[PDB]
Protein: Phosphopentomutase
Organism: Bacillus cereus
Amino acid sequence: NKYKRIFLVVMDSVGIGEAPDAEQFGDLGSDTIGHIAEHMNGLQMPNMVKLGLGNIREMKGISKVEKPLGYYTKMQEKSTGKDTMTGHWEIMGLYIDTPFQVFPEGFPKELLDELEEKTGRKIIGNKPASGTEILDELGQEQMETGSLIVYTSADSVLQIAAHEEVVPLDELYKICKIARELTLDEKYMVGRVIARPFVGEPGNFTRTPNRHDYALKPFGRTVMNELKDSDYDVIAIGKISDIYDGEGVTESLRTKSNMDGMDKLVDTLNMDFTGLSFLNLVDFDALFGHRRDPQGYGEALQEYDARLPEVFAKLKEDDLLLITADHGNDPIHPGTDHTREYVPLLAYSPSMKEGGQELPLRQTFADIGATVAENFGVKMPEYGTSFLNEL
Ligand SMILES: [Mn+2]
Ligand SMILES: [Mn+2]
């Protein structure tokens, strides 16, 4: 081991400019950070800048430094998707030719009519919403009419909510299994169908622990599996566990927000492990990119950066911090979908005594997993070139 512990931080959707193949994704002219910096009239990110963010690309408020703390570069995506699952799966060593649909605004009618025709039920909703907001909005119409409440979040999830006194649990699961088979289709690929039973009465509904999830496991063995199987530690913080459907996860830390995520990261800097601590910061995407809010997005970027000194304070000489993104989601770019963009890569360790340097442009996100695996001496991923030897 060159490093005892590796802290990997995905800043969900924080893209650094349109990818060479953006045209194929309708993302011509996309620039997540750059457009935010323009809207912000200068972005304030002194710590990322210190790590070398501006040395990768110079943007409003983000200028390059003379002696960066870490190593720096951009990564190009190889997989044919720009969704969260595709990104994370690539990062951990896989190549995806069948990508997932994000469905940021809900589902096409033909999929839902097929599910009506297959279930004997009618469907209401079909909108992006939080669990409790849709139950407040449509929970009573569910009870009275017997319709299925079908909704989504920002990412590749199809949720079906129904009252346990109106749709028995067994009928609900049966319906989700149908839905899961129907969305096992490249045109309708969802990553997770979720059964969302609720009880209570109108104006006072509660989701129950009878939630079941129909998720797709990563298309292959990830670097996470290789770590877990050689008895390393794989700590999953935030959506990470969901994203990889538990594959290769040894411990799991749920989080309610970007700040809560950073708090959990600091907790892990405070535990004895050997392996990988792996955090997703999802708010940039869920709260800001999909709501096309570049101001709140700038504010969250600055807020996140303000947490980095706390991280710097806990890093040991044999720790490596890696900071990246899994796609873009430019809040100025048309519509609410993700954007096909390069993602930044920063690599810092306090054992980089005379600072870092520009890494060659990473050809696949899988270069991260390759680096993680070369470090711990487990099975190398099928795709990806390790950059550990440059560090
Ligand atoms: Mn994402
Ligand atoms: Mn998203």
In short: The pocket of manganese (II) ion (ligand 2) is lined by residues 84, 102, 154-155, 285, 290, 329, 338 (CB under 6 Å). Residues 1-97+217-391 form a domain with the Alkaline Phosphatase, subunit A fold (CATH 3.40.720.10).
